[model samples]
Target chain A: GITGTWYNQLGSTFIVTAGADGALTGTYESAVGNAESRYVLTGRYDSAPATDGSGTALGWTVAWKNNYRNAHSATTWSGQYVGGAEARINTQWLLTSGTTEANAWKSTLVGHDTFTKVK
Target chain B: RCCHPQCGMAEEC
Candidate 1:
């Protein structure tokens, strides 16, 4: 259900491939901060009926390795996959930069994104 | 079972 190409509000794009045992892998291209290179994505997919039986649940993470504005940063996106003629993944994301405890609060960013299937 | 597993991580950052 979460196996497809998707794009977010920021125009960022990604592709997902799910395994029989819940493994996930893909590629991500950010629209801004890390636009220069495609990043590897790894995560999981749950095909089991959702708790509310609404959609599938999944999550993914991308480690920023391009040394762009996102150097030393990694982002994780977790959410539910709503499948149908109009499929989508409604997710919450957390982006963390730097490893110092001093900047813990400021270096971490949280946001929401809804990714719609493009293909 | 509104599944929302911690399927990903960024702890290495």
Candidate 2:
């Protein structure tokens, strides 16, 4: 069975991923809504059982920003899989330069989508 | 070799 992924960023709900072994790569459109001008993040996880609460915690790194041109970096410490097809990441964003801005962000495991595996 | 259709060289397929 496949797991569901969800990310809560800046009050906007975005689906992150659904399974493992595939690349979850996409470009964020800065012109949409109150969205920031640029956003990017890369993540990976250790191999384990598909069921939630079975896999070990892995770390993630994220780089994002709002209207500010300066880039900021955030990292999620080791996170564990919460039951019910969900994984929780305790994340914190580091200010690389300018002041802070409000933007929602989350990370999920990739390589499990049916379409991704075929490609 | 018997006359046959032109056989292409085995290049990178």
Candidate 3:
């Protein structure tokens, strides 16, 4: 039931919602380098996170893609610390099939950028 | 999470 707004430093916001049935949908938007980005994301929340993980972060793992990016990327909004009225998420993208940065993770793009849930 | 955790410092314009 993670249904609410997640905020980032660039003023970008994620309107994320995951039903108990695990149907995820939301609007992801942020401005980077003067360019504004927005995407309607339809994704899902998975079971417990990977046990063999790093950073000691264990939380709900989210996976999905842009509503229409033509297989451009498979996005993962890895949920980390889930606290009252807040959740920390590490967002990254795998460009599975893109001429640019294909088969790579663009983690550097959002350095220190974080997601915190809101009611 | 710029355009997302994977979008920044590029022509993502």
Best by the lDDT measure: 1
| Candidate 1 ranges beyond 4 A from true positions | A31-35, A50-52, A66-70, B1-13
Error of 2 at A69 (Å): 3.3
In terms of DockQ, which candidate is strongest? 3
Candidate 1 matches the true fold with a TM-score of: 0.76
Q: lDDT of candidate 2?
A: 0.32
* Candidate 2 local lDDT, A1-119, one digit each (tens): 21333333332222234336632333222213233333443455554646544644444444444354323443232344343323344333332322335433333222210111110
Candidate 3 chain A worst ten-residue window by lDDT: A55-64
Total clashing pairs in model 3: 2
TM-score of chain A of each: 0.84, 0.41, 0.51
Candidate 3 clashing pairs, residues 3+ apart or interchain: B1-B4, B1-B5
- Residue A56 displacement in candidate 3 (angstroms): 13
> By TM-score, highest first, what's the ranking?
1, 3, 2
Pairs that collide, model 1: A50-B1, A50-B2, A51-B1, A51-B2
Docking class of 2: incorrect
lDDT order of candidates, top first: 1, 3, 2
Which residue pairs come into collision in candidate 2?
Answer: A9-A104, A9-A105, A10-A104, A19-A112, A20-A111, A20-A112, A21-A111, A22-A111
lDDT of 3 by residue, A6-53 (tens): 777555567777666556676665433232345666766653435454
